[PDB]
Design a protein around this ligand. Structure first.
Ligand SMILES: CCCCCCCCCCCCO[C@@H]1O[C@H](CO)[C@@H](O[C@H]2O[C@H](CO)[C@@H](O)[C@H](O)[C@H]2O)[C@H](O)[C@H]1O
Ligand SMILES: CCCCCCCCCCCCO[C@@H]1O[C@H](CO)[C@@H](O[C@H]2O[C@H](CO)[C@@H](O)[C@H](O)[C@H]2O)[C@H](O)[C@H]1O
Ligand SMILES: CCCCCCCCCCCCO[C@@H]1O[C@H](CO)[C@@H](O[C@H]2O[C@H](CO)[C@@H](O)[C@H](O)[C@H]2O)[C@H](O)[C@H]1O
Ligand SMILES: CCCCCCCCCCCCO[C@H]1O[C@H](CO)[C@@H](O[C@H]2O[C@H](CO)[C@@H](O)[C@H](O)[C@H]2O)[C@H](O)[C@H]1O
Ligand SMILES: CN(C)c1ccc(O)c2c1C[C@H]1C[C@H]3[C@H](N(C)C)C(O)=C(C(N)=O)C(=O)[C@@]3(O)C(O)=C1C2=O
Ligand SMILES: CCCCCCCCCCCCCC
Ligand SMILES: CCCCCCCCCCCC
Ligand SMILES: CCCCCCCCCCCC
Ligand SMILES: CCCCCCCCCC
Ligand SMILES: CCCCCCCCCC
Ligand SMILES: CCCCCCCCCC
Ligand SMILES: CCCCCC
Ligand SMILES: CCCCCC
Lengths: 1033, 156, 48
């Protein structure tokens, strides 16, 4: 193939041009996102039951739905929470590879058929089935700064005037409103109701009759009387549209003929559908939109399109209304792209500098400058064909591949130059001879590198989807690189390189280059003399090699593992947890104090605090809240002390002092779904109808035993909520029947008043909205208020609630969990330092085996995969190891020689571990992929050394030592050139601080450490490997 | 309220004997109460922690404390079938005839759940078999309505 | 049944359309709401 293209440079250029056009096209059309999809597909079913307690939700909604989740394909597991905010969420998680749309439609369809089994009020609210996702492209906050709007006003403005246009914006896949559109709020007063012998039942009946759409028909409708001249629709009653109309609803006509209107027994106003969340932004009322990227969209274009849409709404904003951007992943992604592009460009300039330094002519310098960009462009084309996106992972895959691509260019060009100087052959014939020396090796190398990288595409679950991004990116780049090395670069060398006189090594040049040349030829002799001495004394080097191998294993076993490094993403969270039963007002006081700290103590770093009172991650309610902190741009936070980790640490320390509240700050995970590499996710399960209290006791028994193994388990804790006091009210049926009071009037009076009731819909400025009745706050606050509510008996008497009821305090659960359809309690924890998660999990199982009869367990989330596709690695690297050996055996036509190459593996790994251990880094995915690329490159170096030596022995009848010395002499320069260029090129990543430096440091340090030791060690050890292996066999 | 008080309310409820022990040594308020008026003794009696009930009483707990609805620890112990706690409470002066706001007595509650041994203990300490709740019901009325013949026999 | 075009549009058509976002390969959407209370919304997708 090289010979073919040496004589057909134009054909080679055409292939190059096609690759470049395909790549250029790919780059224009490639989706861009921070991360590709990684978590397995999950579908969430959400329902609301206004005024329902957790047990009511679970036993009338959750169990019924769960019991119908049958006949759905590829389900791994199902889980649910039923809570005292009247909410249920059931999450169904599917096998990786499941079509998410099909999973969702199967779920929705089984639900549809369960709907008639659900309470009327739940059917009325509706049950949502949605694809579960945790990543937002951005969060647009909307605030009012002149005190003229409440958060309810803002939410309705956003819903009516902003949300739909954002939803229609190019690239946006989903939009969530942080609040609701208005509802018509009827706030009842029990004293007025009793005054007129009315009840919420009467209110509800009047609203249903007087706010309604009524069908009529037509004038002159078919079939008509012939001769009819007109046909027109009859419009009868249509829905109310205003608070004023609602106030005028007629409830009763007194005997004196006076009228009782709804406004006489209730306050009427537009308000929110719910009042559980209070949202503030720097202390001001707030709403917002949570926006997600559509499939295959471009994150950068979508963000810009959203901002453009927002800009044209701006002129129509009510006074005081303002857009803020507390969260936007895009600026971060932009920086990642610039940084990667910058790295690739500098790498190409470095190759230019090193090529010129050693080869000292611009033509040689031109060749890699063309070849590398052609490979990179082609790689994008292949990614496009694989359906990949430009994302954090794929982009770092490309820089992890840089050494490999640069090495192909350098190896081909350098070898031609060597041949010309050593033989006086003209460029064309030198290129032919040169390619004849390396082409077989290049193909063998392509197979070997495929064997190293492809297996990583076969891990399962979430980690597998991550490895797969790097694996396909690197293998694609590597394959294109070898194609280009066999097709384009030989054509270029033959047509662009100038002749070199035999024996000319530039030693007679003037100034710097003559000096460098004389110096470098001298150093090469020192090197070969040294290798000669080494080879007179291989024994001690075998001992040194074992020392290295042992130190590697030692270093490796003590390096803690993680997934992906945290970043200063310009935002972080702070959690606010008050004791159970604490009220919204108490939580608001803590949030205010939190917000005040950031705008005061972190004045220089913090742009805004977005405080969400009433929202929590593992349970909602009045006693929980979150403060989402947005920082100024990195550019104005110079110094390790003004970055997230630092602010965070200080924050949590300052709050350690808050009285009756747990408050603390933390960075965001790179990808939420991965939890901690170290953490586990355990489910305790009621397998025998034991009930909530007994499950709780067993949970506690488990947690107490875990706590006695700090050596293995740390922070073993429940993920959910503890039981709390609840007010149990018993209706006396006998007394109700004696008084002539119906249970139905009793129960709707109670629920409508104290829990609220969705009555029907009305139309507010052309948009359909809900109508709710509920007591005014002051009549539903305390037990004594119960007796202020009256029900009308059949005989017209008003009977106080206290006449037919009794009450007592008891405990019950504010959040009931289920797992695969059975009562459950989720338990989180992590392996103690120096301990594997597998070990921690094994203990948990041991402890779980001693719990009361009927209590079982299961592993879910990150742990589910562990118990599964964590049983694959050494099986995959065993295959990799075997294929590599086989490819080498074919290359060298020997079962023994391949060992002399494989021995090289530890040489780079030791330096990567040293650098990572020393900088206090972890064994994460970036470190791991870099190990592969480092190993790949050292292997390639060794393959060429061994190929040259072997050929010298086979073809020129040279002795073992003689051939080895000559081979190592020839490979010195190109090995050094590549190492120099790569090491410098990856250096910026190593010292990088600022945005995305977490990932940059992770890929740089391991790579730089590995390249140092691989380079220094290999040039002395591979000749040892080769000699000892040949002597042995 | 006090910080030690809160810790005691939690320890009592969870049945952490040793923590209670230490809390008693440090003077944690045995008369602490949460929003619904439950004392450590209410909690211990409800969740059935016998040893804590005894420690609390030795440390001056009010055996007859009542919550915001008028219920005492004896009510709780009787309702949830904690026989030995019931006996200890009574040994320590618990009011056998205490009525909550609904006129409900510990006897009503034990009868309602069919706790026969607890019913016998209550009668032994002078429980008023003819006490009526706000609806005019006695323990016997409850027994027949529930169709508990054994209990109905006892209350005759 | 029985609703006029504007009632149907406000209570049905717009409610559905505002949820017809973020569907793959959607080229355009068109709808009509009429005096018989009938609504038809048609979504047309990219060829292929
Ligand atoms: C240039 C070419 C490059 C070559 C690339 C080839 C890579 C192919 C990947 C193979 C698939 C890996 O994943 C697959 O996982 C299961 C286990 O989870 C393996 O099965 C293995 O694991 C289990 C558990 O220890 C054993 O009980 C089983 O006997 C064993 O064979 C499969 O043998 C393996 O194939
Ligand atoms: C950029 C990459 C490299 C940068 C600089 C690298 C320098 C590092 C030094 C390591 C080289 C090894 O050094 C080499 O060791 C052997 C012995 O094992 C010496 O060889 C000499 O000593 C040994 C034993 O003592 C004898 O058996 C041998 O006959 C003798 O000539 C060499 O004279 C020496 O050059
Ligand atoms: C010529 C052939 C060369 C073969 C060389 C292969 C070694 C280099 C690859 C880098 C990985 C190093 O470390 C290896 O990879 C995994 C990646 O999940 C690491 O991290 C994790 O592996 C598995 C996989 O889910 C986890 O269950 C485990 O808990 C964790 O350690 C492990 O520490 C180790 O198994
Ligand atoms: C608005 C942008 C979307 C926000 C995404 C929400 C992420 C969901 C996280 C909920 C976790 C609940 O609380 C939890 O926060 C973390 C998970 O991120 C943990 O924090 C953990 O993750 C981090 C970020 O990489 C770290 O720097 C911590 O050392 C680590 O402990 C906390 O130990 C835990 O208390
Ligand atoms: C969770 N989140 C980011 C925010 C932030 C600021 C907010 O101001 C709000 C939320 C949650 C949303 C959820 C919505 C939901 N729905 C979309 C209307 C909803 O089901 C409820 C509910 N309790 O059922 C709300 O609290 C809710 O009405 C509400 O008041 C919210 C709200 O006020
Ligand atoms: C846009 C892509 C660049 C096209 C490169 C054209 C350069 C062609 C030079 C070919 C001559 C090769 C020696 C005969
Ligand atoms: C004449 C020597 C041919 C060398 C061929 C090298 C490529 C072999 C690699 C085999 C991998 C399966
Ligand atoms: C896994 C392969 C190990 C085989 C090594 C055997 C080498 C035999 C060579 C015999 C030389 C004549
Ligand atoms: C031979 C390589 C041609 C690449 C085809 C590009 C197809 C792009 C589809 C728009
Ligand atoms: C890696 C090249 C990707 C560059 C495309 C950037 C899109 C810019 C539009 C805002
Ligand atoms: C897995 C393939 C191993 C092949 C080894 C053959 C060794 C030959 C020794 C003579
Ligand atoms: C000799 C084969 C030429 C290569 C064609 C792509
Ligand atoms: C000549 C064989 C080409 C192989 C490409 C990887």
């Amino acid at each position: 193939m090289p010979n073919f293209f040496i004589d057909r440079p134009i054909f080679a250029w055409v292939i190059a041009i096609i690759i470049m056009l395909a790549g250029g096209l790919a780059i224009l059309k490639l989706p861009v996102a921070q991360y590709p999809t990684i978590a397995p597909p999950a579908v969430t079913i959400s329902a609301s039951y206004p005024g329902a307690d957790a047990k009511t939700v679970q036993d009338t909604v959750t169990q019924v739905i769960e019991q119908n989740m049958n006949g759905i394909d590829n389900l791994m597991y199902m889980s649910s929470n039923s809570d005292s905010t009247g909410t249920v969420q059931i999450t169904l998680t599917f096998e990786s590879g499941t079509d998410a749309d099909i999973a969702q439609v199967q779920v929705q369809n089984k639900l549809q058929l369960a709907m008639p089994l659900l309470p009327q009020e739940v059917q009325q609210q509706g049950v949502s089935v949605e694809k579960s996702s945790s990543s937002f492209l951005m969060v647009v906050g909307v605030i009012n700064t002149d005190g003229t709007m409440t958060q309810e006003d803002i939410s309705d403005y956003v819903a009516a005037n902003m949300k739909d246009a954002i939803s229609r914006t190019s690239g946006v896949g989903d939009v969530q409103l942080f609040g609701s559109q208005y509802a018509m709020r009827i706030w009842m007063n029990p004293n007025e109701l009793n005054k007129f012998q009315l009840t919420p039942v009467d209110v509800i009946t009047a609203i249903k009759a007087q706010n309604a759409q009524v069908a009529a028909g037509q004038l002159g409708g078919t079939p008509p009387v012939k001769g009819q001249q007109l046909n027109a629709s009859i419009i009868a009653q249509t829905r109310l549209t205003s608070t004023e109309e609602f106030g005028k609803i007629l409830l009763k006509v007194n005997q004196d003929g006076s009228r009782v209107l709804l406004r006489d027994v209730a306050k009427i106003e537009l308000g929110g559908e719910n009042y559980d969340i209070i949202a503030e932004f720097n202390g001001q009322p707030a709403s917002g939109l949570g926006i997600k990227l559509a499939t295959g969209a471009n994150a950068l274009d979508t963000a810009a399109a959203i901002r453009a849409e927002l800009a044209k709404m701006e002129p129509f904003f009510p006074s005081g209304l303002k857009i803020v951007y507390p969260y936007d992943t895009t600026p971060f992604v932009k920086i990642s792209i610039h940084e990667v592009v910058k790295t690739l460009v500098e790498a190409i300039i470095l190759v230019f500098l090193v090529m010129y330094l050693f080869l000292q002519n611009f033509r040689a310098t031109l060749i890699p400058t063309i070849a590398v960009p052609v490979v990179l462009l082609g790689t994008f084309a292949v990614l496009a064909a694989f359906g990949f996106s430009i994302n954090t992972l794929t982009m770092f895959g490309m820089v992890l591949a840089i050494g490999l691509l640069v090495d192909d260019a350098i190896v081909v060009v350098e070898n031609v130059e060597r041949v010309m100087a050593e033989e006086g052959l003209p460029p064309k014939e030198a290129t032919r001879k040169s390619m004849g020396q390396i082409q077989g090796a290049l193909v063998g190398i392509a197979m070997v590198l495929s064997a190293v990288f492809v297996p990583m595409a076969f891990f399962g679950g979430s980690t597998g989807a991550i490895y797969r991004q790097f694996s396909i990116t690197i293998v694609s780049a590597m394959a294109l690189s070898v194609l280009v090395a066999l097709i384009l670069t030989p054509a270029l060398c033959a047509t662009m390189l100038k002749p070199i006189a035999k024996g000319d090594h530039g030693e007679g040049k003037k100034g710097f280059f003559g000096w460098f040349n004389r110096m470098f030829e001298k150093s090469t002799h020192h090197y070969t003399d040294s290798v000669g001495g080494i080879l007179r004394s291989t024994g001690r080097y075998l001992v040194l090699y074992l020392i290295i191998v042992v130190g590697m294993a030692y270093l490796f076993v003590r390096l803690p593992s993680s997934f992906l490094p945290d970043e200063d993403q310009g935002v972080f969270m702070t959690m606010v947890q008050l004791p159970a039963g604490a009220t919204q007002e108490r939580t608001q006081k803590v949030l205010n104090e939190v917000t005040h700290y950031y705008l005061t103590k972190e004045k220089n770093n913090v742009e805004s605090v977005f405080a969400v009172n009433g929202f929590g991650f593992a349970g909602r309610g009045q006693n929980t809240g979150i403060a989402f902190v947005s920082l100024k741009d990195w550019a104005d936070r110079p110094g390790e002390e003004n970055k997230v980790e630092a602010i965070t640490m200080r924050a949590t320390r300052a709050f350690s002092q808050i009285k009756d509240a747990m408050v603390f700050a933390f960075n965001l995970p790179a990808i939420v779904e991965l939890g901690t590499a170290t953490g586990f996710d355990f489910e305790l399960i009621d397998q025998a109808g034991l009930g909530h209290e007994k499950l709780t006791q067993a949970r506690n028994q488990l947690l107490a035993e875990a706590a006695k193994h700090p050596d293995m388990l740390t922070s073993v804790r429940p993920n959910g909520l503890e039981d709390t006091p609840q007010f149990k009210i018993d209706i006396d049926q006998e007394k109700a029947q004696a008084l002539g009071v119906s249970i139905n009037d009793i129960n709707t009076t109670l629920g409508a008043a104290w829990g609220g009731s969705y009555v029907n819909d009305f139309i507010d400025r052309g948009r359909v909205k809900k109508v709710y009745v509920m007591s005014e706050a002051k009549y539903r606050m305390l037990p004594d208020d119960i007796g202020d509510w009256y029900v009308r008996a059949a005989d017209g008497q008003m009977v106080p609630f206290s006449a037919f009821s009794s009450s007592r305090w008891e405990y019950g659960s504010p959040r009931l969990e289920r797992y695969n359809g059975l009562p459950s309690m989720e338990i989180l924890g992590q392996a103690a330092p120096g301990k594997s998660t597998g070990e921690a999990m094994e203990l948990m199982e041991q402890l779980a085996s001693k719990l009361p009869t009927g209590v079982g367990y299961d592993w879910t989330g990150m742990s589910y995969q562990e118990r599964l596709s964590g049983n694959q690695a050494p099986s995959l690297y065993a295959i990799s190891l075997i294929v590599v050996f086989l490819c080498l055996a074919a290359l060298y036509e020997s079962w023994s020689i391949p060992f002399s190459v494989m021995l090289v593996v530890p040489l780079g790994v030791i330096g990567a571990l040293l650098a990572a251990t020393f900088r206090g880094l972890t064994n994460d995915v970036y470190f791991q992929v870099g190990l592969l690329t480092t190993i790949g490159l050292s292997a390639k170096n060794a393959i060429l050394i061994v190929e040259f030596a072997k050929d010298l022995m086979d073809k020129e009848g040279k002795g073992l030592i003689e051939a080895t010395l000559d081979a190592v002499r020839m490979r010195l320069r190109p090995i050094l050139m590549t190492s120099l260029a790569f090491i410098l090129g990856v250096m910026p990543l190593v010292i990088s601080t600022g945005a995305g430096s977490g990932a940059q440091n992770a890929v740089g340090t391991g790579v730089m450490g590995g390249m140092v030791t691989a380079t220094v060690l290999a040039i002395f050890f591979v000749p040892v490997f080769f000699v000892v292996v040949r002597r042995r066999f | 309220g006090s910080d030690l008080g809160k810790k005691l309310l939690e320890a009592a409820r969870a049945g952490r004997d040793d923590e209670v022990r230490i809390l008693m040594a440090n003077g944690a308020d045995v008369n602490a109460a949460d929003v619904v008026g439950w004392t450590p003794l209410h909690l211990a009696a409800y969740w059935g922690h016998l040893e804590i009930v005894e420690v609390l009483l030795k440390n001056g707990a009010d055996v007859n404390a009542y919550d915001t609805l008028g219920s005492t620890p004896l009510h709780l112990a009787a309702h949830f079938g904690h026989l030995e706690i019931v006996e200890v409470l009574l040994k320590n002066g618990a009011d056998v005839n205490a009525k909550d706001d609904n006129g409900i007595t510990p006897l009503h509650l034990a009868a309602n759940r069919g706790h026969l041994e607890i019913v016998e203990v209550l009668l032994k300490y002078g429980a008023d078999v003819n006490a009526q709740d706000k609806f005019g019901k006695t323990a016997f009325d409850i027994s027949i309505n529930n169709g508990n013949e054994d209990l109905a026999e006892i209350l005759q």
